[PDB]
């Protein structure tokens, strides 16, 4: 009667937004990584009454539909119009909202998988609806499909579940370091993304490697202006300890870098030394989880 | 400095909604008529200040953007983001909202034509944006394109301006009678529209005539349940005086009928006798008007 779903946090390395009035045809090209840390969605469902009510919560606290619009958009569709009872969606995040980790995609997909599992449906149907809700409410373009691909994904063909095409890269002994700082809040960069992005992608499909991605990323963030100087400065210090270049967490004020178990502890020192906040998450190589919550 | 635009009221005879996530590909198949009575949009524009503000009004009274969402959607796009001054859109309707006359399409198109004329643009660009705004805010599917076609239009290929295809029928000595009553406020009819509608269209392209349309309409409204009994009863009385069958104003609680100058006066008696409200409008055979307001 209680369904749990887990969606990994998604961090984009670089990207190219392909906006399209058709949700399923809408998406983005680019590369990202999925963390072992993410969103846990719990769907509680009880039959009864003479009324149909859906309730949503973020980290234990109830949320108005105006702040949960994406999750409600999904729930409204997945919960039968003639259903009588109460549906509760409890979402728990491991990262703050608007920090570039893809929480809304997690809430959209987690919700869609948990409810489809309860009220009937499939993975592709649930996946598409979650994608749809993101694009519809300006939630995101590559988080939902990137989370379905898992691990180190690469969106080579723009589109939603069942339509787009993503690939995965191989990697070894890599963990993810993240220095989350905050949110973000010009026509010049739009054309700087169309170019640097498509360039970074083509260059990655030439050398399919994580190292290559981290280099193609660090360039993308700077060659587009997107990368803040205040971040670039934190980067230049981290780099001195990492075999790979840290890069901006796309659309979030922060940085990330793939690191071995050694460079990690070394970087932990430099960062805690700079009075900076950091997190270490493993690369979630698996796929989203949905099932009866049994522990 | 003051631009005026006139969009005829649009009354649909019957239809078939083709919903499509791509606004321009979205539309409806069907037939309608454009009245000499409609919406007059006046755009007042003054340069100056250090601020950019858009104001909207319906029948002399200012309206919040939440009630003017469609008009603001348009204005926001047509009014330069770097513009400094005040833009005022005064809309005047000849028919109440939600009565099936297409006021929102009139407000959307009128606004789009008046502003494009002021801030630069074209008919197709303005026309498409107005169509877009309708579909986006669930405003309508065939009003904007039907109003561009003018006269007695027939949407044979679903789509928006520049994409869809409408045709026009010939007619003679015909005027329009309308008995507006109110608004409207089941999966069964959805399939009743897909079938009766596409049927009415195919039957019209066999006999391109207004008489035929008025017959194919009176059937469509009933064979789908859409036609209220309380309306059907008013109809059965009108019919006794009209060479042509009155039909329901699609998506509005009312009726309409093409009438000669004679049956008109005769019908005016029967209706004023039934304590009913009625209006006589000529068929607006022309196209929407836009130009500097010079009287
Ligand atoms: Ca759309
Ligand atoms: Ca957690
Ligand atoms: Ca390890
Ligand atoms: Ca008037
Ligand atoms: Ca006459
Ligand atoms: Na997340
Ligand atoms: Na992978
Ligand atoms: Na109108
Ligand atoms: Na005509």
UniProtKB/Swiss-Prot annotation, chains A, B:
Transit peptide keyword on record: no
InterPro entries xref list: GHMP_kinase_N_dom, GHMP_kinase_PoK-type, PoK, Ribosomal_Su5_D2-typ_SF
Catalytic activity: (R)-pantoate + ATP = (R)-4-phosphopantoate + ADP + H(+)
Result after altering residue 131 to A: Does not affect kinetics toward ATP but significantly decreases affinity for pantoate
Effect seen on changing residue 155 to A: Decreases affinities for both ATP and pantoate
Pfam families according to UniProt: GHMP_kinases_N
Alphabetical UniProt keywords: ATP-binding, Coenzyme A biosynthesis, Kinase, Nucleotide-binding, Transferase
Consequence the record notes for mutating residue 143 to A: Loss of activity
Description of how the protein assembles with itself and partners: Homodimer.
Family membership noted in the UniProt record: Belongs to the GHMP kinase family. PoK subfamily.
Annotated NCBIfam families: panto_kin_Thplsm
Entry protein name: Pantoate kinase
Origin species: Thermococcus kodakarensis (strain ATCC BAA-918 / JCM 12380 / KOD1)
